Amino acid sequence: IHMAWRSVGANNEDLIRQLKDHGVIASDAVAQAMKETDRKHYSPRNPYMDAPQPIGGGVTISAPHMHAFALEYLRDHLKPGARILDVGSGSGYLTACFYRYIKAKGVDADTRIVGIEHQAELVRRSKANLNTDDRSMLDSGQLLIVEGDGRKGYPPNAPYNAIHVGAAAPDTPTELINQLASGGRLIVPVGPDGGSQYMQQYDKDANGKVEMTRLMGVMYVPL
Numbered sequence: 588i589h590m591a592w593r594s595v596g597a598n599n600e601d602l603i604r605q606l607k608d609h610g611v612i613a614s615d616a617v618a619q620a621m622k623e624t625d626r627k628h629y630s631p632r633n634p635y636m637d638a639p640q641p642i643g644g645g646v647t648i649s650a651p652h653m654h655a656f657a658l659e660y661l662r663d664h665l666k667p668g669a670r671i672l673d674v675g676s677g678s679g680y681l682t683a684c685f686y687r688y689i690k691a692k693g694v695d696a697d698t699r700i701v702g703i704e705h706q707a708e709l710v711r712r713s714k715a716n717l718n719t720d721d722r723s724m725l726d727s728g729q730l731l732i733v734e735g736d737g738r739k740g741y742p743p744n745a746p747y748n749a750i751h752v753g754a755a756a757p758d759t760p761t762e763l764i765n766q767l768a769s770g771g772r773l774i775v776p777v778g779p780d781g782g783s784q785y786m787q788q789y790d791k792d793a794n795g796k797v798e799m800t801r802l803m804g805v806m807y808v809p810l
């Protein structure tokens with residue numbers, strides 16, 4: 588059996604510090620949001636290993652560095668009073684991070700973080716994770732976990748200032764772009780399941796015109 592090396596932290600704080608020291612985390616705010624959201628409540632096993640871990644339904648909770656990259660990409664869009672959509676909420680981790688990131692920038696009664704997941708088992712599982720973490724997040728009514736097909740976003744709370752997609756979109760996610768507010772940003776892996784995909788960024792400007800930028804090569808493979 589081929590053996591390999593992989594980073595690990597002694598605890599949540601030590602895991603984030605390690606990432607910041609090595610340049611993975613650029614901003615202090617991103618580091619703080621992740622520091623206050625302990626992976627132990629969201630990852631059943633190896634919580635502090637910088638690697639993807641299974642959570643059920645044939646899916647995994649992203650590796651810590653991938654969560655960091657996503658937070659950095661949307662650091663200027665995560666502000667008090669905004670509406671954020673997290674398509675494919677899974678474990679609920681990234682969702683809790685968004686809530687804390689903004690909560691630090693100050694509170695606003697209109698802030699709304701919506702996580703949409705289509706697997707019922709994960710919807711119940713994630714809610715339980717969030718209540719084990721901090722029962723007040725769900726109780727605030729500012730964080731939401733809904734059951735549905737994320738490909739059609741969630742119109743009740745549209746338009747969104749920022750949208751993050753954790754699952755692959757076979758092509759241009761038209762309906763999601765339609766739910767973006769002017770000046771909003773959307774992060775999503777584009778391409779058929781099984782190949783060289785691209786994590787892509789879509790920015791809509793004040794005139795409603797859309798611009799696409801490729802951020803990095805990515806590949807969905809068996810763990």
Ligand SMILES: Nc1ncnc2c1ncn2[C@@H]1O[C@H](CSCC[C@H](N)C(=O)O)[C@@H](O)[C@H]1O
Pocket residue numbers: 644646647648649674675676677678679680681703704705706709735736737738753754
């Ligand atoms: N059409 C769709 N609508 C909603 N969720 C979807 C979906 N297609 C895939 N998913 C969900 O995409 C998620 C990808 S894994 C997401 C992991 C989560 N960000 C974490 O850190 O744990 C899974 O939970 C999967 O069930």
